[PDB]
Symmetry: C2
């Protein structure tokens, strides 16, 4: 019965399509260094205090800039179980075709962003080249990195390394998996270092006529706790301190300058703006549905 | 290109289908007796201050209670021009068929709520009987009253009376235009008097297992100005003071008791909850998309 998970946002001559991969329900305990009672207070304000968990969208974004169609993150495919992986189905439902995707930009290599580039070990996007930051690929694809982290963290790392390798293998085989450095522009997108969540996490800025859109990646995981209390890290952050520093910097910029935001973990479609009354707390303003 | 304007909200064993009729952009002077500078400040906070006007959804709601399919308001059909009138198309897009509708509940007889029940004098919902408050019918259907409104308001009244009559005629002819009074229930929906916007404006509440849902009608026309400043009347209200008094009462209830809200003029799908930090200002918390 439910509507398909795509939404079309128009930015002048550019169409951005929000694509839903699925919905998670995470433990409120994943929010770090904040009393759980205050977490529950914030969730109750936003009518989001469900015993099932903290509802969290996983989104990806298609950007039609006229001559090119670029995909920004791709969802999880099958890497995290049956409830995710809807990105490709919604791309097709939206009217686009996977063969039309020319470029894929990855904010980082966590499986819920990279795995969607492939399915059953073959590329979903046969004409696309995949980009991710130099720093990000270095961290996940160095066979020496595993000894450089505490034993508690080694199993998880190795496990996601395998999922990463399987997704990108079909693109490496075609010489279509690329890395970039700061200062690099790709398809008119500007790359912005927003490290912390992962060592090479980047966001991507698209400037169009009269509107800037930032595809922020995982500098935030909630429209609730981390907006009222932006200093709140989450357990998914590899460097929580650095990730907090990064969010506070970017949210300040967004509140002041009013960029349109596209986020993989804000409520689908995940497109909106951030307001702040005082520079201390922020409020997520979703865009208003436009038929 | 754009996704169809229907959305499924599940409440226990009840399915609520939000249906988009279209989108209006009203001038900011429609908000009464509030400095336009403050209106503009608030619009800016919610990134809603665009040159063409204040974006305002027009929605209707299907409620599937298992044994009955009920439609709550119906959009504007052709009564206001061609940017509106999508409800029937979106109903069909959602998978339902108009023959399945057995009950139509009207919050009030404004054209953007009643005209959708028919298309040029033929019933869109052949199996449905329509209910509206007796106070409301009395106000619009007593061919004297036109003379008791201020002279500058009479022409509009006569104008909308004729649209109302055109739309309800084919239901009256089948003995299927009924009125009710306070204390009556219809298909297990409770009626709530919320007069002011129109003299017989009513809201409808459904108690499901674990959740109460109020279909509030036109006690509000914005998620912005009239939440941050809930005392702000709108030029569309027939009795602004009363309409303000009604909104204030209901929003205090909603903030306290946490009812789920379904509104025809909040941003589509128009479903969410009301929060307040101080009993003075309110915040619209939209629901989080669930695949
Ligand atoms: Zn991540
Ligand atoms: Zn993620
Ligand atoms: Zn009205
Ligand atoms: Zn209305």
């Amino acid at each position: 019965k439910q509507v398909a998970g795509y939404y079309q946002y128009q930015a002048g001559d550019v169409q951005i399509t929000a694509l839903l991969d699925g919905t998670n329900f995470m433990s409120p305990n994943l929010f770090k260094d904040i009393p759980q009672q205050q977490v529950h207070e914030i969730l109750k304000k936003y009518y989001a205090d469900q015993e099932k968990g903290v509802q969290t969208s996983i989104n990806a974004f298609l950007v039609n800039i006229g001559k090119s169609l670029i995909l920004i993150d791709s969802g999880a495919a099958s890497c995290f179980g049956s409830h995710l992986g809807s990105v490709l189905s919604n791309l097709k439902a939206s009217g686009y075709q996977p063969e039309q995707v020319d470029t894929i930009l990855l904010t980082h290599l966590h499986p819920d962003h990279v795995c969607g580039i492939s399915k059953d070990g073959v590329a979903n996007f046969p004409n696309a080249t995949v980009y991710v930051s130099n720093d990000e690929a270095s961290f996940w694809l160095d066979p020496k990195q595993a000894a450089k982290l505490p034993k508690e963290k080694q199993a998880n790392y190795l496990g996601t390394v395998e999922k990463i390798k399987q997704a990108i293998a079909p693109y490496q085989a075609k010489q279509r998996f690329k890395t970039y450095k700061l200062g690099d522009d790709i398809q008119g997108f500007k790359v912005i270092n927003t490290a912390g969540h992962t060592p090479g996490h980047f966001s991507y800025e698209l400037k169009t006529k009269g509107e800037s859109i930032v595809f922020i990646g995982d500098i935030v995981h909630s429209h609730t706790v981390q907006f009222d209390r932006p200093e709140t890290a989450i357990e998914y952050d590899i460097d929580p301190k650095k990730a907090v520093e990064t969010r506070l910097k970017q949210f300040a910029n967004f509140a002041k300058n009013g960029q349109t935001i596209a986020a993989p973990h804000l409520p689908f479609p995940g497109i909106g703006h951030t307001y702040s009354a005082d520079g201390k707390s922020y409020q997520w303003i979703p865009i208003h549905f436009k038929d």
